[model samples]
Every structure is written in C-alpha cells, then in structure tokens.
Target: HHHHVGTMIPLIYHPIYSQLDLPVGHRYPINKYRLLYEEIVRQREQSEAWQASFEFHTPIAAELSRITPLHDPDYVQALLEGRLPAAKMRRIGFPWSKTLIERTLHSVGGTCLTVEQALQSGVAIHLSGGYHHAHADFGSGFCLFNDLAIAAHFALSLPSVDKVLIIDSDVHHGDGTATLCAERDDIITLSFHCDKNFPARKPASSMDVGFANQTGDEEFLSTFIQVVEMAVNLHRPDLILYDAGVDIHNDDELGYLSISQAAIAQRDRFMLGLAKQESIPIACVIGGGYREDHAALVPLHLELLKAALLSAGY
Candidate 1:
C-alpha cells in the first residue's frame, strides 16, 4: 500500500515508559520520556503544522510468547519473576522491580507498534526505544530487552515486509543486535558508534562505522552521509529502523563525540529524506541520551519529530 497524502504519521508512546523507580543518583535519565511527550504536546499547541502532523497511540505490553522467540525463556521468566541473579541484575544496572518489568515490556511493545504503523503509513516514531545492548540470554548497560532486534524479527514475520534494515546511530555499539541477527540474511544491522566507548569488545554488524573520541560534525557527517548512501544502495531494504540517539551531542554526559544540534538535525533529516526518496517505510526511536537536566534533553529528542513533520510535508 502506498502512503496517503495528508495522513498524520503515528507517534507511539505509553505513560509507564518513564515511571521506572531508580536510585536518586542513577545514570539513566528516566524522566526524559515524560518531558519529551509534554514538549511535543506543548509544541503542537503553538504550531498549526505540528497539530496536524501526527497523532499519539498507546501500545499494550509485549507478551512472553512474543519475546521468547528472540530471547531465552529462562532469562525472560527470571526477569519477570524477579529471580535474576545479583550479578545479572548488576550487569543490567537497574534494580529489579515490578515497575521495571512493566516498563520494559511496554517499551518493546511501543517499538512493535511503531513498526506496524510504519508499514501502514510511510513513517512512525516512538518516544522511547533503542535498547540495543540487551543480548539473547543476558541484559547489559541498562538494557533489559533488545527492542530493535525483536522489532526487526516482528517485521520479518509479516507478508508485506521481506527484508529489514536496522540503522543504529547511537553513540554506543549495538552489540546485542549485531550478535542476535548475525546469521540472518533477511535482516541487516548497521551501527555507527564511538570506538572507545562502552562495550569494550564490539561484535561485527552487517556494517560497522566507528568514530574516534571528540569527532566533530564536519568529519562525522561527511563519513556518515557516505556510509548511509552505500548501505542503502547495497542492501535495498524494504524497511528502515532508525535509532536516533542524541547521546552523541557534545554536551552529553557519557558520549565521546562532539556532534552539534544542527548536525544532528541534518543527520535525521537526511535519513528521513532518503526514506521518502526511496519510497521505503521507516520507523524511528529515541535512542540513548545522557544528560543531568531532563528538561534540557527534550529538544534533542524532539529532533526526530521535527524531521518527521518536515518529511511529511507539513
């Protein structure tokens, strides 16, 4: 089916996404999700174009049957039942609670909903996702589930989609996604990340682009544009799953890159433009972003929505 002109694109979100209870000094910025939703609503009130650009949709929590295909049943059960060992919980970097489980399941469900919406519309954006660090049998780096991997598999099961391309532009490597889909020819994983950042040992993706620490916009964008051009040309994917991580911002607390806000806007616009030009369905998710100030981080996350509205001809 072709995209309908003047159709409002889908923006998937759930209230429980930002309600996880963590320690006071936790590194994960959980409040950003709620702030992002509020910012979008605030902008919609001010801009006529944004008011007509999109509609919000809530997703049901993912079922165990849906998750078990890509993840170990034991691991999934352990997490849900709060039976995960201390070491595994430590690796995940989050204290286990019922709230965490609900958030994790709903977060994965939101991405799945985004994929469904992208198939119906030309593009769909999720306010939270891109948990690429979670492995098949284990979790790491605050990632309890590999949403990108599971969503790719979910897309492949449909008749309309034959192949899927996961474009991970997060500052950290998508090691779990790469390893999970290593042998699948129908799914292509491409990651752009810092070489010296987290996940000391990086696995081979379908394509991996590593950047040096403190790499600025000029050098970063020049290579990024070329790499994306090459990947799309070679893979010829039916759908593009984009992880628009803002952690690459120069002011981010954990990331090492020096990419500016303007460059990030350009990067997001270019990807959406390519999808529009190629007539390929695309879904986007707000990936990792680290900042102490939750309010300050909302604008960076909103770049994807801004790019989506522009691409939709608003």
Candidate 2:
C-alpha cells in the first residue's frame, strides 16, 4: 500500500510523559512536554489547514519484552522493580518511583508508536523522545531509556524496512544510541552535537559531526546540509529517524552551541523536505532542551510539527 497524499500525519504523545514526580528545583524540565502539547493545540485551533493536516495519538506503555532485546534484561528488571541502588538512580539523574517507571515506559512507547505511524503515513512526530543518553545498562542525563535505539530496532523488524538511519541533531552527543547500535549494520547512527557539551567522553557513531561552542546558524547549517546530503546518498536508508533537539538554541541552559530558533526551523524544514523529496519514511522525536521556564520551549519544539504539516502541503 502506498501513502496517499493529504493523509494526516501522526503526532504521538502520552500524558504520563510529564507526570513524573521530581523535586521543585529539578533541572529536567518535566513540564515542557505538557506545555508543548498545549501549544500545538493552540496553534491547531488558529489554523484550519493545520487542524486538517495532523492528528494526535496516545501510546500504551511499552512491554518489557520489547525493551529487553535492546537493554540488559537485568537492568530493565531492576529499573521496573524499583530495586536499583541509590547510586544507580543518581547516575540516571532521577529518583526511583513507580510514576517514574510508568513515565519511562510510556515515553519509550510514544516513539515506538511514532515509528509505526511513519511507516504507514511517510512521517510522524513524537512530542517526547530522543532519550539518546541512556545506555544499555544504565540511564544518565535525565534519560531513563534509549528510546531512539529501541525504536530503530523496532522499525527494522518490519518487512518493508530494511535499513534505518538515525540522525541526531541534539546539542549533546547521542552516545548511548551510538554505543547500542555500534554492531548493527542495518541501523546507521549519525550525530551533530557540540564537542564541549555533556558526556565529556564521546563514542564514535557511524558518522559524527561536532561543532564548537557558540557555533551559529550559517556555519552550522551549511555543514549540516553537506553532511546530511553525504549520508543520505551513501546509505540510501529506507527510513530516517530524526532527533530534533532544541537544546542547540542559544538560550538553552545545558546547550553549549548558539543556534537560533529560525535556524532550527530551517533545519526541520530541510529534513522533512528531504524525506518528501526522496520518498523515505521519517520519524521525528523532540530531543533534549533545558530551560527552567518550560513555556519558553513550546515554540522550539513546535517547529518539527510546523515543518511536517508544511511539507505535507497544509
């Protein structure tokens, strides 16, 4: 079956994504997911075409069977059972709670759902995902699971998909995803991250493009276009998994690069446009963005959806 033009793109979300309990001064920005969803609804109400071009879908919690394949089963079991030692929990950057477990499972589930939708409709966006910091046996940088890696494996399971390319544009390196998929030839991991950012030691991805601190739009975008062009041409992937992390913005607390909001919009449009031009199914995830004022992130996260709708001829 072919994807029909005018088919509404899927936007995946789950309320539990933002419901994880954390301390008042927590730096994770847990509320941003809910705020981003509200902003999407607000914008959708303002435009008839946008309302017609996209629809929201909620995901069920991911089953353990689906996770154990990519993660250490003992690690997954400890996390689910809330039996991890305090040090491990600290390393994950979150205190263990039943709610945290639920939220983590659903967060991963949302991306899996997005992959399925992209396969069916050509493109789908996950409002919360891009947990590329989580490793196979442990979580770190506020990432509890490597959803991008798991979802890549999930996509490859389909008969229609033979190769998957994960393009991570988050300001921070996608070390976990790179590490987990290192041996898999079917899944190619490419990352454009700041060299001076988190995870001081970076692992090698299939392709890695590192930018200096405070690198601006022109240099960043030009290099990005060239690198992406080269990767897409060389791999000819059947599907593209994009991590559109807004943390690259100048205003982000944890982000070291100086990319602007408009540049990010341009970046999203280019990726979505390429998918349309090449007839490759693409799934997107809102990656890391750090800001205490959660509302400040709404517009940046919405860029992906805006570009997706625009690419679909809304």
Candidate 3:
C-alpha cells in the first residue's frame, strides 16, 4: 500500500530478517522477527489505527560502501565470504550462512531507511535492529554488524542532520558503538545497561548508566528519563538513534535487570514521545533480547512500534 501523508509511521523490515536457519540452541532467536511481523499484521487487520499507523518497507542489502567506512574492510570481506576462523565465528554466536549475510545487510539497511523516514515524519521504527555489539573489526554477543553505529554515521551524512544522539537501553553496554564513535564529537552514545552484564571491560561511552542486577522499574524509568533529558539538552541533536533493547525484561534469558513489560512501554513512549515534543527526529532500533520462547518474545519486541504509534498520536 502507498504511504498516506502525515499518517502512516514507517516500519522497516524484510522477510529475510528471520529466513536464516540457526543451529539448534543458538543464542539469538531469529524466528521472533517473522513472528513479530505476523503479529503486527494481525493487529493491523484488527484495528484501523494499527493498519494506517504504519507503512511497511522492505529494505535491500546495504552496500559495502555504507558499511566499510565504519567497519574494517578485511573483516567485512571475511565475514561475508565465510572465511572467518571457527573460533571467531563461535565468539560471534551465529554460524555464518549466505542467509546470515543477507540478514545482516538488510538489518542495517532497515535502520538507514528508518533514519530517512524519521527525518521527515519525526519518528520511525525498525522491526529488527540494535546490533550494537558488532564492532568495526569483528562481531560479538550475537551481533554481526553494528547497525546503530552505521546508522549514526548515516544520519550524520544528511545535510539536515548535524549532531546525532544515540540513547541505548539494551541490557548489555553498547561497547562496540561507543568504541567506534568514541573519538567523534558529532555522534554521542548514551547507554543505560546492567553494569555486571557482558563485556567485563566496558569501553567509555559519551555517557554510561550502569546499574546493578535486579534493578526494578521505578528507578530504571526515573533514572532513564532524567538522564535522557540531560543528554537531549546537552547535545541538542537534530537526529536521534534509539536502541530499544528488550533484554532488560525480568524474564529475559540474558538480561540481569528486572524491568517489567509495562515499564518497557512507559520507557518507549517517553523516549519516542519526548523526541516528538522536542521536535527531534528519532529512529528506533530493536537492540538485544534472548528469550527461548520465540512466540512469547514477539510481543515484547513489538512494544516499540506500539509506543511509536501512540507517541505520534495514532
């Protein structure tokens, strides 16, 4: 369907997002994305707001030029050609496949598209994203390419976008993104994560909100909103890339924090809604989650889209 002016929020996704077959017991739940898509379609069928609230776009694979600037050329070629050593591949957590290559490319492309749409619409959402652990030279924690890092640079390239602020709420620290943009002044990384989670050695981000395990909803929300306001005021960014990772759920297999589902909605709505109020264009990316019951996890990941629609007055 064609986009309706000032009505439909752009939702970027591709079937290939979940088309890859993972080995049994893979850490990343690849199927949830497809489930998330079908669930959204079901919601669309059931409600007018859900149907007209979003315009779906299937993004193509991002070009090498789009990736190479932020990643190591040698590493990119190695991962794409399946020439990465077995140990390195194991560390990345996904067995390389042609399908993996396509999925990774499209995931980054989806974020690029989201940024483009957000610039015009004041908000946009990607069904899959927040691959923040991927670094310039390699991947980690089930992340192959740092889409947040790539999208931050992509946003910066726009003449209208000057300063870009990344507010990452993933349970794990956005170490790769922080590392990649550490030296740059235009792109700022603000991460709120479990202190004792992953990557024992954390790279310094522009701002890091590290909390202990079992941190609950109230404090998490309070702290997040407070810091978000501080970051927004300090940076005054023209564009924002939000990493809305759901791994912070109390039930999430990987996350250590005890944030609830309702809290997630509250957080999402505030972040997206506040950006709209401030006249800042914000694009959201699903960061990280590792639940075993892929079906149950679909709705958790879909929370951001629901929040985005509400924030945009849908």
Q: Best lDDT goes to which candidate? A: 1
| Pick by TM-score: 1 or 3, better one | 1
Tens digits of per-residue lDDT, candidate 1, 24-128, equal: 788999999999999999998999888888899999999887798889999999999999999999999999999999999999999999999998888999999
Which residue pairs show backbone clashes in model 1?
none
lDDT of 1 at 203: 89
lDDT per residue, candidate 2, 1-314, as tens digits?
Answer: 24545657899988888888778889888999999988889878999887878899999999997898889998898998989889989988988999998998998999999999998988999999999998889888888889999999998899999999999999999999999999999999999999999889898999989999999999999998889978999999999999999999999999999999999999999999998889899999999898999889989988888888889883
For all predicted structures, in order, the TM-scores are 0.98, 0.97, 0.97
Off by over 4 Å in 2: 1-5
lDDT of 3 by residue, 212-290 (tens): 9999999999999999999999999999999998999999998899999999999998998889889999898887788
Looking at candidate 1, the ten consecutive residues that score lowest on lDDT are 1-10
Computed on alpha carbons, the lDDT of every model, listed in order, comes to: 0.92, 0.91, 0.89
Clashing pairs in 3: 130-287
Model 1: how far residue 62 lies from native, Å:
0.7
